A paper describes a structure:
Recently, we demonstrated that cmo5U modification requires the previously unknown metabolite carboxy-S-adenosine-L-methionine (Cx-SAM), which is generated by the CmoA-catalyzed conversion of prephenate and SAM to yield Cx-SAM and phenylpyruvate. Cx-SAM is subsequently utilized in the CmoB-catalyzed carboxymethylation of ho5U-containing tRNAs to yield the mature cmo5U-modified tRNAs, with no involvement of a mo5U intermediate. As predicted from sequence considerations, CmoB is composed of a Rossmann fold, coupled to a substrate-specific N-terminal domain of ∼100 residues that is unique to CmoB. Our biochemical, genetic and structural data demonstrate that the primary in vivo function of CmoB is as a carboxymethyl transferase in the biosynthesis of cmo5U-modified tRNAs.
Cx-SAM bound CmoB structures were determined in two crystal forms, resulting in 10 independent copies of the complex (two tetramers in one crystal form, and one dimer in the other), while the apo structure contains a single dimer in the asymmetric unit. The dimers exhibit symmetry-related interactions that recapitulate the expected tetramer. The overall fold of CmoB is essentially identical in all apo- and Cx-SAM bound structures. A total of 16 sulfate ions were modeled in the two independent copies of the apo-structure (seven at similar positions in both independent molecules and two additional sulfates unique to each of the molecules), which likely originated from the crystallization media. Of particular note are six sulfate ions, present in each independent molecule, located on the surface with positive electrostatic potential surrounding the catalytic site. One of the sulfates modeled in the apo-structure occupies a site analogous to that of the carboxyl group of theS-carboxymethyl moiety in the Cx-SAM bound structures. There are no major structural differences between the active sites of Cx-SAM bound and apo-structures, with the exception of Lys-91, which exhibits a shift of ∼4 Å. The side chain of Lys-91 contacts the S-carboxymethyl group in the Cx-SAM complex, while in the apo-structure it interacts with the backbone carbonyl of Gly130 and the sulfate that mimics the S-carboxymethyl moiety. The side chain of Lys-91 exhibits conformational plasticity, interacting with the active site sulfate anion and a main chain carbonyl in the apo-structure.
Numbering used by the authors: 2 to 34, 37 to 323
Write the structure that this text describes.
Amino acid sequence: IDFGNFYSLIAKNHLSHWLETLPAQIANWQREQGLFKQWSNAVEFLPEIKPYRLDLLHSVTAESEEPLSAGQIKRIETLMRNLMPWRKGPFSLYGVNIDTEWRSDWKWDRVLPHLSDLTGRTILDVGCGSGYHMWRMIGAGAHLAVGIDPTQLFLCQFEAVRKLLGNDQRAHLLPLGIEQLPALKAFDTVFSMGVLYHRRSPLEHLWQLKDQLVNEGELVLETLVIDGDENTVLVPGDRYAQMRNVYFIPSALALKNWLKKCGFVDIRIADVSVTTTEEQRRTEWMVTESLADFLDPHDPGKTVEGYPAPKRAVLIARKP
């Protein structure tokens, strides 16, 4: 797409120095990135609608004054469905209700009471997927939410939702991997949910997260864990819950220790929860394999491979 809106936005704020690296990286990505033509076309064929009623606080919902025609709704439906799989959500957009694989609204509600007041903050969502959580952040009072995700489809999905939200400029998605960033040190709060178990180097992931935070900034870390003490860390084989390159699944206490090791303070384990099939499952918007498929049919306490079932922790830390 044209990131000139975003470059122009940070040129006049505390992220201006990101222009020293960002535009060159996007320029490289725009070259390298067949299915994208089909996904990006789906976004362009979508209508430009300005929400008459918008709710970013209790969900991500958009309404028109008078309902849309059954034909324009069908257009949105079949266009949005071209961007499957839809994993993080849900979105309610002019009656089109995108029920995503994840009930990310649950995880948001559970995480929120533990967060520092988002009001006025500038935030980085690492591996943001669809960008669902960023819209919630705007609703909770965040000034600016930036997500990064190198998956091409998530960019189209977020821009799709953006243009259905009236080209809202308060959230953005940049097709970068967290590796590619310098030490920006400019975000009040960094979220890293669903990313750590995918990193070859877990400590360097945590340092790289710290490098994006202002002093006394907040880190919200969410990832897969197992049960155990400080010394308990699983590294799975070829597949874990059918995922191909999973590296480190520590216990939450292990993770707590890791955050301390990397220079974080006031580290709180804010929640540990088994992932259930009510939170993650197949929908009309995500139809391929999901959690129930990943579990041992005769023991939901285990994956299909033998490992303990998906369990997710939420840690919160402060950068001194």
